[PDB]
Structure 1
Amino acid sequence: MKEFYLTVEQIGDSIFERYIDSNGRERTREVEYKPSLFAHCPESQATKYFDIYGKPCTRKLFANMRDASQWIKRMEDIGLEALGMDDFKLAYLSDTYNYEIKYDHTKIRVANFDIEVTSPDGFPEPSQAKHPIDAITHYDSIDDRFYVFDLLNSPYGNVEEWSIEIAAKLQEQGGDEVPSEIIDKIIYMPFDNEKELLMEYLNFWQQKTPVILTGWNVESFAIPYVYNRIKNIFGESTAKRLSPHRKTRVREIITLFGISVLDYIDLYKKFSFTNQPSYSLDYISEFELNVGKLKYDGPISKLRESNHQRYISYNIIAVYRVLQIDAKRQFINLSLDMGYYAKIQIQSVFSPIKTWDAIIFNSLKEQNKVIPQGRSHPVQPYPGAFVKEPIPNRYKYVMSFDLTSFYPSIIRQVNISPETIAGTFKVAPLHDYINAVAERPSDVYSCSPNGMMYYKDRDGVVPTEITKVFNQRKEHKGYMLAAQRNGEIIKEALHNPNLSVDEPLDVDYRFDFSDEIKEKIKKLSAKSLNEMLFRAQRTEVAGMTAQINRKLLINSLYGALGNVWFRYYDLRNATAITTFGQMALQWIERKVNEYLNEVCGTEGEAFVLYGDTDSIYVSADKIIDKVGESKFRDTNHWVDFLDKFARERMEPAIDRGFREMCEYMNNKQHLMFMDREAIAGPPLGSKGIGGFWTGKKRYALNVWDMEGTRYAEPKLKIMGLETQKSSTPKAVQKALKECIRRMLQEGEESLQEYFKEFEKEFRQLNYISIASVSSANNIAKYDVGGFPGPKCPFHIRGILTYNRAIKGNIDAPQVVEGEKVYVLPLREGNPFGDKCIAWPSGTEITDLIKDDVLHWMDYTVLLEKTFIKPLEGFTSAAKLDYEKKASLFDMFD
């Protein structure tokens, strides 16, 4: 097979590389790499090297990497540009792997681990590592085995061996319910001393050295704890065995040279597109996998002592949970894909700037072109997208339209790149271009309304490389949408399931079901169908991960143009994109309004009610009215009608409008592709209002079709409202959403019934479910003798109240700076001495003060502040009442 790297590092004048060879074997080599950099040279000098602007350069070979970096400094002292890739390991990878890397993931050692540390005096600080490590579970992807290291003898208690027989038993049998599919994969090792455990773990590590190292919070806890514990016990030289090159670099984070650490919490935060109230593994596992919380009696600091059996079982389970989350989300696969595509260290996938620098560098190197030197720039603001101010109101029938990959398509259309800049023109006010009254900027170059002109013959490296990734994105989105469409087919077949014993069909959910498959589905059992729906949704999530993160990468290339740390930073190019974007949106709003007035036979009516960046929301009341609501059989009938109308009439008109804009700006290629997104409206013959807007970025719609996916049941599309915010209490989100569902689908009366019921019963809701959530930043900034300082935020005040309440209890959970907290208001005269209290999110509040918090919660404040105020906002906007008003009719019986 073709060779591929695993890890690369620079240590002095040496490049240390771990790699898989042509026979599939892992090897390590130290290479005294000789890098090249470039300097501008006279035009009369024969060379094959040119910078991106076409100026000739000469290549300077250096005896070692130190001589190259010293030359860079000297060139700085002279005042001349030192060109070329200054990150020598990226240069090394590019030289060593001068082809498209095809890798075999089964050859890559991915290690998932988690440690346990009993601490009687609070959270065990990794920098101190003063407590024994009493458990390590380490899963190896190559062995497919869970290696379990169990400390039997500790100063905090001597325990019996963990029993795999009991671990496998059901909870109802007094077992631990360790999943049956990993029982035979567990390799259990008890130890009588901590030193012997750690020594063996190091020997194990040497034999099975991770390439990718992951787990939950491994970078901030597990890795530094293990490193510091081993260092404190055996000495630094022994601790350095954690690095395959014996080099490490040190609240601290340890860099293990020759290992690529991908902490799963960081992968999840970057790639999941969620914002969670808590990031405990417990919480995320429940959210992602729908598994129950790992229950136990007493505190964690005594779990090993009281129930060591469960203690070890939960350690193993914790490792497995991350594997299960990755099997669903596939962020490891994404990191490997992106990393090898860019030819970077795998951990550099967290940095889109490093990623794009490497992609562009490799692309330019292929043509013997030389990259410019990074330069220092001051941070400056620059304008972004346009957002229309909507008239707050209900909106019955709505169709939306969105542009495909907007900013990257602008880049490709206008041909925006550092080296395709051609000149400038004199700008007219933006609305002059929008209304097509300003003179055509250029009949030679491709232009943006910010004043920039670009060559339209030349291939730009930014357009070229963004197109390649965009093409990957488009493929994966197709798989995602098909899996989604396949999902609805299965959901509708769950309305008439057969009573028989069969099996789920063997199909590729990435492609639309054939008629044969669909026929078989209608005769399938409920058990088989539910299993198919599961596999369909899993296939959809896999596609979603792949497509939405390639979308993120290409949008981050736009973003990088506005980042001073980017080698190709240029506010001329960044603004060219956003300004063109503002023009395109407002241009097509006009075209859409014009076309719809023409087909509806009216004049001057506003059809576009809202728009943000690249989307428009079209009021379709008059389209429905022209055909008359009476002529429709059911809801699905008018949905098909609007689907057809948008597809056969509106979209061709939109394409005509954009083609004209492309000619207006003399652009290189028409790539403004705006298709229908959502069809929204109330159920036919209902009192539902269909949708409403309260303001910019705040609306709700009752959607029947989304991007070609015809829902089995109508799905609420809610943006910006409190239902969508992690800060809103769980039970309030749920209640507010039901309020919205009733408004959009059923009407005012239905809303009023539900509200009355909620108000009556809400005090019985669990305290966690009605707690607000907030991030805890700068606690110390507002701490004045344990009391709130000037301008102390509400949630920070709650934390200070908590701290005073648990003062003198070394066992009580501490609020961690930067993490999230649950927040509850307190009734007047409470023993806590303040109007609110906060505690670490994702946890029960400590038993020390739990009963008193429950007693003093302010349900009245909770209701009117988190529930009623947002509800008042929704309903006044939609022009209705959540509560029956007083009338002259009240004087009757």
Structure 2
Amino acid sequence: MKEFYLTVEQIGDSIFERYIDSNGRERTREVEYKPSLFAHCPESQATKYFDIYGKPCTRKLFANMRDASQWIKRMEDIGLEALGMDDFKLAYLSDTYNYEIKYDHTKIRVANFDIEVTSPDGFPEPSQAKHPIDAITHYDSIDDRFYVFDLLNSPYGNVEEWSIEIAAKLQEQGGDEVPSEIIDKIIYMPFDNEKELLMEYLNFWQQKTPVILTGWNVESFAIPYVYNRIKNIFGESTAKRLSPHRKTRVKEIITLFGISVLDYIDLYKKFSFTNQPSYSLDYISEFELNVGKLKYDGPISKLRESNHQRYISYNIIAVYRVLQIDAKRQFINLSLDMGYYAKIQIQSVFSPIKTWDAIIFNSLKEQNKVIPQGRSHPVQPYPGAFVKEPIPNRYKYVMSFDLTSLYPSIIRQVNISPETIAGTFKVAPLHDYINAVAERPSDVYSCSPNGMMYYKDRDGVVPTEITKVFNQRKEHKGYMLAAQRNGEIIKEALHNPNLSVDEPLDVDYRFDFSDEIKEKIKKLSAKSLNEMLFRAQRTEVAGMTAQINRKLLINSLYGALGNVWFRYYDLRNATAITTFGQMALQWIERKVNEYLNEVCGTEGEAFVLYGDTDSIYVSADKIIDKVGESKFRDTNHWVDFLDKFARERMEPAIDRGFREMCEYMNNKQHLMFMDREAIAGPPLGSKGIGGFWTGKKRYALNVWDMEGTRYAEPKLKIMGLETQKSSTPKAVQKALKECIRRMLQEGEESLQEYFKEFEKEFRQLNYISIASVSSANNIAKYDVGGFPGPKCPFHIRGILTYNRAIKGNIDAPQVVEGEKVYVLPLREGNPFGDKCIAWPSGTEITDLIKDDVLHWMDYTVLLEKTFIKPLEGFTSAAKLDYEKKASLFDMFDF
């Protein structure tokens, strides 16, 4: 196999690398890497090297990396650009591995681990690591085993060994229900004391040092803990054995040289794009697997004594959940994939600046071009996306259209790049350009409304670099589109397979099956066809990953581009992009309004009701009324109608218009393409209103079709309203949705009935479902002797009413800083001395105050403030009454 790297570090004048060699065994080597950098030279000096601007550069090969850095400092001290890749690990990686790297994930040691630390006095700070580590479950992907380290004796308890038979049993039998698919993979190791345990762990770690270290929150707790604990008990010298190169750096995040840490909690917050209200392994675990972490009774701090059997099983299942999630989401793989693509240390996968730099670097390197020295830049804010102010109201029929990959496309269309800047032009006001009344900026260069002018005669580095990715995206998606076709020509080729013992043919499922190997296949045994589709899958699976990676770079490029720490950052350019986009969305709004006014005979009617960055929402009321609502059989009939109107009437007008704008700004290439996204309206023959907007980023639509796919039942698309906020009490968060559903699909009368009913039934709801949820920060900065200080928030003042109601109690759950807290208003004259009273979330109020809380809680204020207030918000905008007998005059200002 072709060698590939595992980790790379720069220690002094040496590069330390862990890699898989020719035979496939893990190795480490120290290399006195000699980097090259470049300085500008005169035209005379012949040379193959040039900077992105064409100017000639001379290669300077150094004796070692320190001289390289030293030189970069003198160049700065003089005032002359020091060109070249300053991050030598990157250069070293680009040098040692210049060829697409094909990696064997079965040879990379990927470790997931979690520890347990019985602490009776509050969360155990990793920096103190003041308590014993009573358990460690460390799963190793290479051995595919769960190595468990159980501490038997601790200042907090001596316990029996953990039982595996018991762990295997069911809940009802007293077992811990550890899945049978890992039950034989566990390796238990109990110890007499923490020292014997840590030293054995430290040893195990040396015999199986991780390459990829993951787990839930390992970078913020597990690692810093184990590190500090070992450091405090044995020497710091010993705690360093945790690094294969014996080196560590304390940022409290311990960085271990020679290891890549992809905290799974961060890999989730990155590549899942599913903003969740909580990031606890339990919450996220239920979400992805419909099963959470093991359940136990009492407080964790007392679980090791009370039930050490469940304690150890809990630690094993915790590590196992993460593995399951990743078995689904595949993020570690995605990370490996992307890291080797750009030739960077896997952890850099988290950095777009770092990722793109390395990609553009290796590309320009292949052309003997040298990259610019990254200059320092003031962080200066510039304009961003355009968002229209919607007229608050109900909207019966709406169709939205989305510009595809807007920002990367604008980069390509205008050809925006640092080295393709060609000048500027007098900038007229942005509206003038939106209406084509401003003077054509230039008929020589490709322009942008902010005043920049780019060359059209050359391919900018950024544009070229982003286009390859777009192409590769298309390419791979192409491959795995065939892995599909070829999927059926093998899936049904097994429903009626002859009985001829043979072997699976040799075809490239990336490319559609030919006839020579299309029917020659639908006549093989059964032992082959079932393998025929094993290759069809693996292939397809491969496609998805590359295609997903490509999509992630494309969408992150602008991120890097707008960042002042990016090598190609340029305020002028960052602004060319966003302003251009700003013009695009409004110009096309102008066209859509014009086209629809003509094909409707109306005059100056505002069809586009809303736009946000790359989206426009068009009202279709008129288009529907042209055909007369009555002439439609069912709901599905008009949904079909609008779909066609869009595809054969609107989209062509759109392209035609965008096509005009391209010529107007003299752009290198027309890449502004729109897609019809949603189609919403109320159920035909119903009193439903279909949709409404209360303001920017705040709306709800009853959608029937999204990008072509027709739903069985309409799906509510709600953006920004309280139903989407986690601070809203469960019961309310679901009644508000029911209110919106009744409004869009059923109408005012339906809504009013639910409302009345909900009020009538509010007090019968469980006090936790109707409690607000909030996170407490600066909980101390606002209290003075247990009381609310100056500018003290509502949830925080609340916490202090809880504190001054349980002060002097250790069996009562404490409100820590950061974590979420339920909040509730109390009637005046309550024993707690204040308006609100919070307490930790996910828990029930301590029974020592509970009965009085359930008593004094101000249902009225609660209802009004969390339910009625926000609904009134929705109903006002939708011109609806959630209560019969309401006055029309209320909607007027004085």
**TM-score (ref. length: structure 2):** 0.90
Question: How far 1:526 moved relative to its partner?
Answer: 26
Contact kept in structure 1, 2:294 and 2:317, CA below 8 Å: no
Question: How far 1:852 moved relative to its partner?
Answer: 4.4
Contact kept in structure 1, 2:417 and 2:461, CA below 8 Å: yes
Secondary structure, in 3 states, of the residue corresponding to 1:146?
Answer: strand
Kindly provide the CA deviation profile for residues 868-888 of structure 1, in whole angstroms up to 9, marking residues without a partner as x.
111001111111111122699
Q: Structure 1 residues 862 and 327, CA, compared in 2 at 3 Å: closer, same or farther?
A: farther
Secondary structure, in 3 states, of the residue corresponding to 2:737?
Answer: helix
Question: How far 1:83 moved relative to its partner?
Answer: 1.3
Kindly provide the CA deviation profile for residues 240-273 of structure 1, in whole angstroms up to 9, marking residues without a partner as x.
1111111111292111110101111122223332
Q: Structure 1 residues 545 and 57, CA, compared in 2 at 3 Å: closer, same or farther?
A: closer
Kindly provide the CA deviation profile for residues 30-74 of structure 1, in whole angstroms up to 9, marking residues without a partner as x.
111111111111121111111111111111111111111111122
Q: Does 851-860 or 24-33 show the bigger shift?
A: 851-860
Contact kept in structure 1, 2:338 and 2:549, CA below 8 Å: no
Question: How far 1:817 moved relative to its partner?
Answer: 3.7
Secondary structure, in 3 states, of the residue corresponding to 1:70?
Answer: helix
Q: Using the alignment, how far apart are the partners of 2:489 and 2:860 within structure 1?
A: 45
Question: How far 1:559 moved relative to its partner?
Answer: 2.8
Kindly provide the CA deviation profile for residues 738-768 of structure 1, in whole angstroms up to 9, marking residues without a partner as x.
1111111111121122212222223333343
Q: Does 464-473 or 501-510 show the bigger shift?
A: 501-510
Q: Structure 1 residues 537 and 65, CA, compared in 2 at 3 Å: closer, same or farther?
A: closer
Secondary structure, in 3 states, of the residue corresponding to 1:182?
Answer: coil
Q: Using the alignment, how far apart are the partners of 2:538 and 2:723 within structure 1?
A: 25
Question: How far 1:383 moved relative to its partner?
Answer: 0.8
Kindly provide the CA deviation profile for residues 638-671 of structure 1, in whole angstroms up to 9, marking residues without a partner as x.
2122112211111111111111111111111111
Contact kept in structure 1, 2:293 and 2:317, CA below 8 Å: no
Kindly provide the CA deviation profile for residues 817-865 of structure 1, in whole angstroms up to 9, marking residues without a partner as x.
4444333333323333332233444444555555544444332222111
Q: Structure 1 residues 221 and 806, CA, compared in 2 at 3 Å: closer, same or farther?
A: farther
Q: Does 120-129 or 855-864 show the bigger shift?
A: 855-864
Question: How far 1:408 moved relative to its partner?
Answer: 0.6
Match of 1:135 in 2: 135
Q: Structure 1 residues 718 and 499, CA, compared in 2 at 3 Å: closer, same or farther?
A: farther
Unaligned runs of 5+ in 2: none
Q: Structure 1 residues 133 and 278, CA, compared in 2 at 3 Å: closer, same or farther?
A: same
Q: Does 211-220 or 768-777 show the bigger shift?
A: 768-777
Q: Using the alignment, how far apart are the partners of 1:18 and 1:406 within structure 2?
A: 40
**Residue 450 (structure 1) aligned with residue 450 (structure 2):** yes
Match of 1:776 in 2: 776
Kindly provide the CA deviation profile for residues 545-573 of structure 1, in whole angstroms up to 9, marking residues without a partner as x.
98777555434322333222122221110
Q: Using the alignment, how far apart are the partners of 2:430 and 2:738 within structure 1?
A: 43
Q: Does 692-701 or 633-642 show the bigger shift?
A: 633-642
Q: Structure 1 residues 501 and 855, CA, compared in 2 at 3 Å: closer, same or farther?
A: farther
Kindly provide the CA deviation profile for residues 122-151 of structure 1, in whole angstroms up to 9, marking residues without a partner as x.
211211112111111111112211111111
Q: Using the alignment, how far apart are the partners of 2:528 and 2:771 within structure 1?
A: 40
Contact kept in structure 2, 1:280 and 1:842, CA below 8 Å: no
Contact kept in structure 1, 2:154 and 2:194, CA below 8 Å: yes
Percentage of matched positions with identical amino acids: 100
Contact kept in structure 2, 1:502 and 1:528, CA below 8 Å: yes
Secondary structure, in 3 states, of the residue corresponding to 1:10?
Answer: strand
Match of 1:830 in 2: 830
Secondary structure, in 3 states, of the residue corresponding to 1:519?
Answer: coil
Kindly provide the CA deviation profile for residues 693-739 of structure 1, in whole angstroms up to 9, marking residues without a partner as x.
11111110011111122212211111111111222222222111111
Q: Does 877-886 or 765-774 show the bigger shift?
A: 765-774
Q: Structure 1 residues 36 and 492, CA, compared in 2 at 3 Å: closer, same or farther?
A: closer
Number of aligned residues: 893
Contact kept in structure 1, 2:75 and 2:81, CA below 8 Å: yes
Secondary structure, in 3 states, of the residue corresponding to 1:569?
Answer: coil
Question: How far 1:285 moved relative to its partner?
Answer: 1.3
Q: Does 560-569 or 521-530 show the bigger shift?
A: 521-530
Secondary structure, in 3 states, of the residue corresponding to 2:583?
Answer: helix
Q: Using the alignment, how far apart are the partners of 1:632 and 1:362 within structure 2?
A: 59
Match of 1:863 in 2: 863
Q: Using the alignment, how far apart are the partners of 1:652 and 1:881 within structure 2?
A: 41
Q: Using the alignment, how far apart are the partners of 1:343 and 1:241 within structure 2?
A: 27
Question: How far 1:222 moved relative to its partner?
Answer: 0.6
Q: Using the alignment, how far apart are the partners of 2:636 and 2:520 within structure 1?
A: 24
Question: How far 1:482 moved relative to its partner?
Answer: 13
Match of 2:813 in 1: 813
Secondary structure, in 3 states, of the residue corresponding to 2:527?
Answer: helix
Q: Structure 1 residues 136 and 510, CA, compared in 2 at 3 Å: closer, same or farther?
A: farther
Question: How far 1:105 moved relative to its partner?
Answer: 1.6
Aligned-CA RMSD value: 5.9
Q: Using the alignment, how far apart are the partners of 1:496 and 1:866 within structure 2?
A: 61
Q: Using the alignment, how far apart are the partners of 1:772 and 1:503 within structure 2?
A: 63
Question: How far 1:592 moved relative to its partner?
Answer: 0.8
Contact kept in structure 2, 1:783 and 1:800, CA below 8 Å: yes
Q: Using the alignment, how far apart are the partners of 2:756 and 2:539 within structure 1?
A: 42
**Residue 33 (structure 1) aligned with residue 28 (structure 2):** no
Q: Using the alignment, how far apart are the partners of 2:620 and 2:495 within structure 1?
A: 31
Q: Using the alignment, how far apart are the partners of 1:852 and 1:494 within structure 2?
A: 68
Question: How far 1:321 moved relative to its partner?
Answer: 0.8
Q: Using the alignment, how far apart are the partners of 2:881 and 2:115 within structure 1?
A: 55
Secondary structure, in 3 states, of the residue corresponding to 2:220?
Answer: helix
Contact kept in structure 2, 1:275 and 1:726, CA below 8 Å: no
Q: Structure 1 residues 64 and 521, CA, compared in 2 at 3 Å: closer, same or farther?
A: closer
Kindly provide the CA deviation profile for residues 50-106 of structure 1, in whole angstroms up to 9, marking residues without a partner as x.
111111111111111111111112222222221111111111111111122222222
Contact kept in structure 2, 1:415 and 1:455, CA below 8 Å: yes
Q: Structure 1 residues 889 and 856, CA, compared in 2 at 3 Å: closer, same or farther?
A: closer
Contact kept in structure 1, 2:294 and 2:318, CA below 8 Å: no
Match of 2:349 in 1: 349
Contact kept in structure 2, 1:113 and 1:215, CA below 8 Å: yes
Q: Using the alignment, how far apart are the partners of 1:160 and 1:752 within structure 2?
A: 62
Q: Does 699-708 or 803-812 show the bigger shift?
A: 803-812
Secondary structure, in 3 states, of the residue corresponding to 2:484?
Answer: helix
Q: Structure 1 residues 526 and 391, CA, compared in 2 at 3 Å: closer, same or farther?
A: farther
Contact kept in structure 1, 2:293 and 2:318, CA below 8 Å: no
Q: Using the alignment, how far apart are the partners of 1:783 and 1:892 within structure 2?
A: 42
Q: Using the alignment, how far apart are the partners of 2:35 and 2:782 within structure 1?
A: 51
Question: How far 1:811 moved relative to its partner?
Answer: 6.0
Q: Structure 1 residues 818 and 41, CA, compared in 2 at 3 Å: closer, same or farther?
A: farther
Q: Using the alignment, how far apart are the partners of 2:132 and 2:199 within structure 1?
A: 13
Q: Does 306-315 or 792-801 show the bigger shift?
A: 792-801
Q: Using the alignment, how far apart are the partners of 1:782 and 1:655 within structure 2?
A: 57
Kindly provide the CA deviation profile for residues 784-842 of structure 1, in whole angstroms up to 9, marking residues without a partner as x.
33332322222332333344444444565554444443333333233333322334444
Question: How far 1:782 moved relative to its partner?
Answer: 2.7
Contact kept in structure 2, 1:484 and 1:709, CA below 8 Å: no
Q: Structure 1 residues 212 and 714, CA, compared in 2 at 3 Å: closer, same or farther?
A: same
Q: Structure 1 residues 493 and 796, CA, compared in 2 at 3 Å: closer, same or farther?
A: farther
Q: Structure 1 residues 204 and 249, CA, compared in 2 at 3 Å: closer, same or farther?
A: same
Q: Does 515-524 or 791-800 show the bigger shift?
A: 515-524
Q: Structure 1 residues 149 and 452, CA, compared in 2 at 3 Å: closer, same or farther?
A: same
Contact kept in structure 1, 2:162 and 2:312, CA below 8 Å: yes
Q: Using the alignment, how far apart are the partners of 1:471 and 1:594 within structure 2?
A: 35
Contact kept in structure 2, 1:425 and 1:453, CA below 8 Å: yes
Q: Structure 1 residues 447 and 66, CA, compared in 2 at 3 Å: closer, same or farther?
A: same
Question: How far 1:492 moved relative to its partner?
Answer: 22
Kindly provide the CA deviation profile for residues 348-400 of structure 1, in whole angstroms up to 9, marking residues without a partner as x.
12221111221222222121111122222222121111111111111111111
Q: Structure 1 residues 37 and 330, CA, compared in 2 at 3 Å: closer, same or farther?
A: same
Match of 1:889 in 2: 889
Q: Using the alignment, how far apart are the partners of 2:505 and 2:769 within structure 1?
A: 40
Contact kept in structure 2, 1:488 and 1:711, CA below 8 Å: no
Q: Using the alignment, how far apart are the partners of 2:48 and 2:826 within structure 1?
A: 74
